[PDB]
């Protein structure tokens, strides 16, 4: 098993396919579609190219009770080679809104067939998230230095996408939106600028109330989270630094370029002002002549 | 009366489209193929819900390179997952050539037409789908005898359609002598839209994230110099621009590309670029501390 | 329709109540058209030569075109000019030619059944198209005048609304549903609304769209909230695009003259 990971890259196909398979098992209300996840690994970047359904039953009475049809998984993999002989198990997807604690026991079963720690890719079917509608975890077993026993736990990794160029234009072809969450002109990136700041608000809210929850409702004092929080402050500026004074000098510089650029545009349009007057001036004569 | 055949439009679900592209480009230039699972409802809608790939061969497409043994196992895999419906045809990918059926492919198609008459052949060009257009065209065999009787007009009855011919040359030979091509529409849901349009996790990490300010100074330097050269060129032009006949001035005093226009494009890009960048600096500096 | 019932009880002569029907008034229009219609029969030939009849799209343009040109009085010139040419066509090109007779013979109430008589279901069986396209052409003939015609078209629909339907049946049932729409236009027949609702619920290929149009015509202007919602919903229910288009615009017919009482549906449709 690879115990080295960094990122998860996801093909667009994977997400869409799990939503299709979800409605065709007709799953909802704690019955959640679970299929196998196919792709490349032994790589720090988990590259997920495809996904398929397995025959799976989820009991809603107990989620620690589940059905997985193990025999099917071997047969399906032989047909995966027929398509392309470089797709293997690298985990399993969940279709639910969020992480279950029965998902740790499920993850055990796919270890048997993987040369990499098994991936949990939550494909939402309500399409939440302010980035991608996918969350990503990989199960890691580690000692915890907080005085608590060895856990197997799902630790978060970033989500990214790797899309084939051939496929990507199909996304553009399908999509008739002119894009307001991706770069464009000034106004488009002006939305992108406000959108990012409003994203920071939402993310900043959740930390504050997690900290409240720890010392009154008694959620674990998790040192690893709070350590990254200490580094947020140390990497945070302080007023009266000559670096943040240099920002003032650097503001002057780019604004002045805008100031001259603005003048340049004003000149050019005043050439067209005079042109049109010369066009009206000739067309007085033509009218008068008729 | 007999049976009348009429227009259809092949609706390639968003899922189906990505799979054909993925499987087809990856296997190019060796020919790729696979079956189309879907359903026919209506009399104007072929709805392809999913496709899969059948194993490649270095004999490419053949009537005996279809392989039903593999089809049967695959069908039972969808049956256990509750996804089987009806195989609505076959697709195959020509490598860098156009969409047209080969003579061999006509006989591959003749087999599936027996099994279901509404079966299509969907010819894919993957090395041409890296434009801003995806090139995919669809065919469906029509009886040779019917073509003699002038029953190609029959296939466009009861709408004006979006009728257009995207490709001729081998295509219009095969249409004439075999098939009726179909236009292609795409189906997708409102869920699937949101999945497709989303392509970054850095959506909220792109107006707080910024580029190095040395790179910005280099950029302002580059931009201002470029427009300085274009201005000298413009100045040479606008020593006249006052004689009869616009076209004579454009040749003589170069208004070849119009240095007015050229300066406008360049001005406007760097001007817009700087307003975002200043705005990013000022947001972070004031808000964070 | 409400006005005549009142005038009877105020006490009036039956001459007046004949006018208010409009059947006399249509005939006065018939006469005017009978006498003065100036039509180029040679133009019809030059177009006939250029636009082939076995070429189906080409055949339609002509049938429609000549049908408009000779529209108003029963003219059998089109039939005789193009006598072999019509039979060359089939599929919807032959459907149009039959129903184009009702464009030419539009109005002509007295002779309304009579002239369309050889193309009627149960006196024609050669094609499914002719059988359906007469019912539609019979509907144009009584368009705005079909108070009697409503029952006669409805018999065929209710007979065919128990079927799951064949593609043989669909072509007959389609023209019935367009025809009865015109016949019952703005007469507020809930009988017709019910009858065509069961046709839409068959899920038939051409007929579901044709039924959807027909309800909107009959129930023009009423703004019935049952009809508005049921049809709005059915677009998701249906899986045929034709059927989906037919419902959307049939709601248009229903919200005629209802301006901002109809604001609410528009907002939802968009």
UniProtKB/Swiss-Prot annotation, chain A:
One of its GO terms (cellular component) is proteasome storage granule. Coiled coil: none annotated. The modification N-acetylserine is found at residue 2. It holds the Pfam family JAB. Residues 8-143 form the MPN domain. The keyword Iron does not apply. GO terms for biological process: proteasome-mediated ubiquitin-dependent protein catabolic process; ubiquitin-dependent protein catabolic process. PANTHER family: 26S PROTEASOME NON-ATPASE REGULATORY SUBUNIT 7 (PTHR10540:SF7), EUKARYOTIC TRANSLATION INITIATION FACTOR 3 SUBUNIT F-RELATED (PTHR10540). Present with 19800 molecules/cell in log phase SD medium. Acts as a regulatory subunit of the 26S proteasome which is involved in the ATP-dependent degradation of ubiquitinated proteins. This is 26S proteasome regulatory subunit RPN8. The gene is RPN8.
Curated annotation (Swiss-Prot), chain B:
Residues 10-145 form the MPN domain. Pfam families: JAB, RPN11_C. Coiled coil: none annotated. It comes from the Eukaryota. It is an enzyme of class 3 (hydrolase). It comes from Saccharomyces cerevisiae (strain ATCC 204508 / S288c). The lineage of its organism: Eukaryota, Fungi, Dikarya, Ascomycota, Saccharomycotina. Its EC number is 3.4.19.12. The gene is RPN11. This is Ubiquitin carboxyl-terminal hydrolase RPN11.
From Swiss-Prot, chain C:
GO terms for molecular function: enzyme regulator activity; ubiquitin protein ligase binding. One of its GO terms (biological process) is proteasome assembly. N-acetylated by NAT1. It comes from the Eukaryota. Keywords: Acetylation, Phosphoprotein, Proteasome, Repeat. GO terms for cellular component: nucleus; proteasome complex; proteasome regulatory particle, base subcomplex; proteasome storage granule. PC repeats lie at residues 96-129, 133-170, 175-209, 210-244, 246-270. Present with 4750 molecules/cell in log phase SD medium. Acts as a regulatory subunit of the 26S proteasome which is involved in the ATP-dependent degradation of ubiquitinated proteins. Interacts with UBR1. Belongs to the proteasome subunit S1 family. This is 26S proteasome regulatory subunit RPN2. The chain holds residues 271 to 540 of 945 of the full protein.
